[PDB]
Amino acid sequence: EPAWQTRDHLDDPVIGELRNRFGPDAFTVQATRTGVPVVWIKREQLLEVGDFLKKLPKPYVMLFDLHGMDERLRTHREGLPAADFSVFYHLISIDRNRDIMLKVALAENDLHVPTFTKLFPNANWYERETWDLFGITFDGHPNLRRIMMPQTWKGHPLRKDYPARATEFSPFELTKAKQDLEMEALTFKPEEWGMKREDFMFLNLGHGAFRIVLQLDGEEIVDCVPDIGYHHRGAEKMGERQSWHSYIPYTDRIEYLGGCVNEMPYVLAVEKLAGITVPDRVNVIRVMLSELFRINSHLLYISTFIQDVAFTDRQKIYDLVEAITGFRMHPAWFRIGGVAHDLPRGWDRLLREFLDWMPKRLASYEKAALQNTILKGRSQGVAAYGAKEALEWGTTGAGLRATGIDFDVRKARPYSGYENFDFEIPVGGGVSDCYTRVMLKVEELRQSLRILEQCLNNMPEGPFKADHPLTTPPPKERTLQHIETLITHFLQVSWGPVMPANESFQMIEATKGINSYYLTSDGSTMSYRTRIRTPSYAHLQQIPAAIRGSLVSDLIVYLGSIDFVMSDVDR
Amino acid sequence: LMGVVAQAGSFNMTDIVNSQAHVWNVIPQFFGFITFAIAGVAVCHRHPFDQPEAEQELADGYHIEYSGMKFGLFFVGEYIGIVTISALMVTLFFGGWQGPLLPPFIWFALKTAFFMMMFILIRASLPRPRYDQVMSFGWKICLPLTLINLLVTAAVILWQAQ
Amino acid sequence: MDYTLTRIPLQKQEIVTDPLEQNVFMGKLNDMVNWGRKNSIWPYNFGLSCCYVEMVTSASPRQADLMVVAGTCFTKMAPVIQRLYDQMLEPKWVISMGACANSGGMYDIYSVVQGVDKFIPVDVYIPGCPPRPEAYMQALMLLQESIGKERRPLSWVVGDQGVYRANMQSERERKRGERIAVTNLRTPDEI
Numbered sequence: 001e002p003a004w005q006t007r008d009h010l011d012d013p014v015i016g017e018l019r020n021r022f023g024p025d026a027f028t029v030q031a032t033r034t035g036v037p038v039v040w041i042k043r044e045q046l047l048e049v050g051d052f053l054k055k056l057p058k059p060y061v062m063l064f065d066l067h068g069m070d071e072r073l074r075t076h077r078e079g080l081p082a083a084d085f086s087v088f089y090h091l092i093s094i095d096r097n098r099d100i101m102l103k104v105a106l107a108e109n110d111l112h113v114p115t116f117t118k119l120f121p122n123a124n125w126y127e128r129e130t131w132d133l134f135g136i137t138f139d140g141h142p143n144l145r146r147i148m149m150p151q152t153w154k155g156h157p158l159r160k161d162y163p164a165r166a167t168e169f170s171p172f173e174l175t176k177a178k179q180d181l182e183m184e185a186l187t188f189k190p191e192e193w194g195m196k197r198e199d200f201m202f203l204n205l206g207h208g209a210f211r212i213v214l215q216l217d218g219e220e221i222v223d224c225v226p227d228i229g230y231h232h233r234g235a236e237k238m239g240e241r242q243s244w245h246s247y248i249p250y251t252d253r254i255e256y257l258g259g260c261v262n263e264m265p266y267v268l269a270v271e272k273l274a275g276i277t278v279p280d281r282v283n284v285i286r287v288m289l290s291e292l293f294r295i296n297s298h299l300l301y302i303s304t305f306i307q308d309v310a311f312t313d314r315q316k317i318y319d320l321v322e323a324i325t326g327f328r329m330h331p332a333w334f335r336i337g338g339v340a341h342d343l344p345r346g347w348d349r350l351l352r353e354f355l356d357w358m359p360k361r362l363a364s365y366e367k368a369a370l371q372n373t374i375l376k377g378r379s380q381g382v383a384a385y386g387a388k389e390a391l392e393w394g395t396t397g398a399g400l401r402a403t404g405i406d407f408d409v410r411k412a413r414p415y416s417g418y419e420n421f422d423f424e425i426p427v428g429g430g431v432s433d434c435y436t437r438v439m440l441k442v443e444e445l446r447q448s449l450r451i452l453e454q455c456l457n458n459m460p461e462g463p464f465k466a467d468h469p470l471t472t473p474p475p476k477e478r479t480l481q482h483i484e485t486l487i488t489h490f491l492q493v494s495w496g497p498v499m500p501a502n503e504s505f506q507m508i509e510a511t512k513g514i515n516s517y518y519l520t521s522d523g524s525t526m527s528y529r530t531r532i533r534t535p536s537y538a539h540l541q542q543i544p545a546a547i548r549g550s551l552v553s554d555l556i557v558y559l560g561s562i563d564f565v566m567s568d569v570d571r
Numbered sequence: 572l573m574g575v576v577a578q579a580g581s582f583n584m585t586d587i588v589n590s591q592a593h594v595w596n597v598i599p600q601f602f603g604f605i606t607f608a609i610a611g612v613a614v615c616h617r618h619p620f621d622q623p624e625a626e627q628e629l630a631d632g633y634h635i636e637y638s639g640m641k642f643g644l645f646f647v648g649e650y651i652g653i654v655t656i657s658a659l660m661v662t663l664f665f666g667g668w669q670g671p672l673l674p675p676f677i678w679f680a681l682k683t684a685f686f687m688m689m690f691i692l693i694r695a696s697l698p699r700p701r702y703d704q705v706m707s708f709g710w711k712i713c714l715p716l717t718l719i720n721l722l723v724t725a726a727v728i729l730w731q732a733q
Numbered sequence: 734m735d736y737t738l739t740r741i742p743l744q745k746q747e748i749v750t751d752p753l754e755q756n757v758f759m760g761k762l763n764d765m766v767n768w769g770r771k772n773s774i775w776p777y778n779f780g781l782s783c784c785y786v787e788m789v790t791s792a793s794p795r796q797a798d799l800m801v802v803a804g805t806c807f808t809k810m811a812p813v814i815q816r817l818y819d820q821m822l823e824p825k826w827v828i829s830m831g832a833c834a835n836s837g838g839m840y841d842i843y844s845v846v847q848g849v850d851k852f853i854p855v856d857v858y859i860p861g862c863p864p865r866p867e868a869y870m871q872a873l874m875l876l877q878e879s880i881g882k883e884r885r886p887l888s889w890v891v892g893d894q895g896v897y898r899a900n901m902q903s904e905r906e907r908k909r910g911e912r913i914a915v916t917n918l919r920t921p922d923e924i
């Protein structure tokens with residue numbers, strides 16, 4: 001059986017547990033291509049269903065995702081409840097090494113959902129994002145406001161009736177916002193931000209750039225709401241606009257340091273929708289480029305964390321990326337067939353030159369990072385949390401394995417032929433300290449070098465594009481001298497590849513955590529729904545849960561130790 | 572500086588450069604030399620004792636909110652301070668305008684520029700310490716050492732009193 | 734060549750000749766002023782998403798008389814961009830990096846302002862997703878030429894109180910011969 005087959009997952013024992021608990025009725029199992037069991041739960045049963053899932057013998061401990069969807073324009077809805085809107089909760093159980101999806105249907109007149117922050121505290125920002133982008137209100141939610149758009153925003157962006165175009169730029173509105181920014185500290189009301197109202201001083205503290213409001217007891221900091229949404233590009237709303245093929249640069253531009261790693265999950269989910277099984281050479285090329293960009297991101301993170309208390313490495317990786325792909329930063333090279341072009345006739349020499357010179361650089365990096373007693377003393381014991389503040393606040397990056405939780409996507413749910421590459425993932429012990437996170441990323445960088453060495457050793461010489469008719473684009477030479485290939489190239493470039501109406505989901509170990517794409521297709525050439533779950537969103541949500549009882553310097557050292565990206569957070 | 576004044580006996584600079592007629596003051600008082608160099612660097616707000624707001628984020632530099640000729644005046648004032656500290660250091664520890672063959676002003680300019688290149692070198696070599704060892708050093712290691720230097724130079728100039 | 738005069742985005746500009754062709758001491762002193770402004774240029778690299786990190790591999794405001802707008806023009810950050818623009822002091826120049834600062838730049842969507850051209854004047858544009866540092870350096874040379882051929886008021890008391898921007902020949906017309914006269918290229922099947 002192919003891995004892209006539309007499965008119903010009634011053989012999952014969690015479905016049997018739900019049938020034993022809440023009866024065979026009262027929930028509807030949906031057969032999707034997401035690879036996870038999807039159950040439609042009624043609205044009033046949602047809290048007790050989540051409570052039952054939290055009290056299993058191997059419970060579903062992490063809320064992976066929580067977001068809405070506009071079902072008003074969805075034509076192909078067979079086996080689904082009558083829904084104007086829907087809210088889906090993606091939950092992960094690591095002990096079971098499984099995951100479930102919980103969809104709640106909503107009508108136009110009553111867009112009210114019971115809150116989920118009393119069960120999973122990372123649901124706060126997800127429910128705020130659902131209230132911002134959709135019109136869905138959550139009952140019993142503190143400081144429920146817009147998180148991606150400013151509070152002076154009328155419509156809801158991710159709704160289907162909202163136009164996804166830039167309107168005329170009036171300077172009068174920009175002058176209102178400039179005057180508001182001038183009096184932001186003067187007319188500051190700490191009740192809209194969800195704050196406690198003589199020591200307490202409120203200030204806006206201006207990788208990316210973002211404001212974080214701070215409540216001061218002298219220098220020691222008691223409350224903080226990091227103001228995000230300043231880097232909101234509307235990647236999902238443009239996903240409803242672009243076709244399956246034109247959205248690849250937008251998947252590059254959500255996380256610029258990752259790039260090709262970030263166009264991996266969209267491509268894999270699109271291939272799941274199209275039913276494409278790519279050959280092994282495509283898988284090896286994907287693995288090599290993903291680990292190359294992972295090495296780039298890890299080297300930049302280590303260099304940034306070590307600078308405050310690198311050029312030639314990133315330039316050589318960028319030269320190799322420029323040789324393989326187009327320009328260095330945003331490759332836009334992963335296609336639905338799998339790659340845009342074949343590898344050139346000199347990549348062996350460049351990859352071997354890169355791999356025969358980096359181990360001594362790793363030795364120098366480890367000698368530096370093991371001997372800086374000032375950096376070790378500054379980075380020890382700061383923002384300490386073991387497995388509990390990391391199992392409930394998302395935190396799927398190097399911190400999750402720094403807690404000791406053995407959960408890597410490349411091993412738990414292998415993709416793109418990562419089972420064929422031998423690499424031992426690193427895991428921390430106990431406390432997820434900042435220094436332990438940096439050492440974990442150093443060991444991950446060493447493992448990525450090992451994976452690249454394995455890719456250089458055994459590269460298959462098969463095709464670089466699959467034989468499926470939905471590979472967009474088709475191979476170029478056959479397009480240029482055969483007419484059927486010209487037909488497929490024409491209709492997959494002009495209108496877009498017509499993909500059947502299914503639901504797909506790809507979960508990927510990114511350069512900074514777990515990035516996932518969730519694509520709902522309505523049978524058209526566009527995407528009816530594109531959902532991008534990002535690690536840095538949940539990594540930024542956990543600063544209030546960790547830096548309550550620390551200083552500003554400790555806060556910004558923790559902020560530097562987090563590998564977050566603001567454009568990655570705000571999509 | 573009282574180390575050199577106690578070795579010479581007067582405040583006047585001509586008396587210093589005439590009391591350095593046989594031996595230069597750098598070799599009997601090397602502790603005074605290094606303490607005066609460190610103090611001259613720190614008073615002038617040069618590179619190791621620069622941006623003390625770097626260890627905090629509720630503090631920014633005082634150089635900000637100036638623009639144009641005021642910030643330029645701050646910059647050139649720091650540099651005339653470091654070159655006059657170089658001139659004071661050579662005329663108080665090395666030989667003030669003293670040399671075998673070259674003219675005295677040429678010798679003074681050469682030794683001053685020699686101190687300037689030494690300042691460039693110690694800028695290029697030593698990394699920035701943080702604030703706590705800066706205070707701890709500048710009190711605990713700096714002030715008892717110069718007091719002991721004054722006591723020892725008093726003892727040796729009173730021992731050979733003829 | 735002829736100039737545009739700005740005198741005391743919505744203001745009017747007229748295309749006139751330079752006032753230096755109408756004194757001989759004012760001509761060389763204005764040349765020295767333009768030379769001094771051209772050679773010593775202090776940039777203020779604005780920290781944005783993904784062109785700012787690209788020119789990292791290549792200070793405080795109001796001493797840097799030049800702003801390089803790198804990233805995407807978000808509607809929340811556009812007041813920050815304009816406020817930081819009015820912080821700086823005349824003379825000031827603007828270099829736009831990437832398509833996101835020239836235009837909307839692949840984001841024609843609700844939350845993106847279509848370039849900083851909508852609200853602040855831009856002296857030099859650089860096209861394309863992230864430009865190379867050498868492209869930034871060649872834009873610096875182009876802007877140095879533009880600054881070197883300018884007529885600004887030397888004092889706010891005596892003289893013409895108007896800024897004269899030169900109409901440079903466009904780079905596509907100047908480099909048209911060397912671009913059209915390109916016969917062959919290396920095949921993309923190698924390195």
Ligand code: SF4
Binds near residue numbers: 805862
């Ligand atoms: S032009 Fe490209 S690299 Fe530059 S800000 Fe826009 S998306 Fe980022």
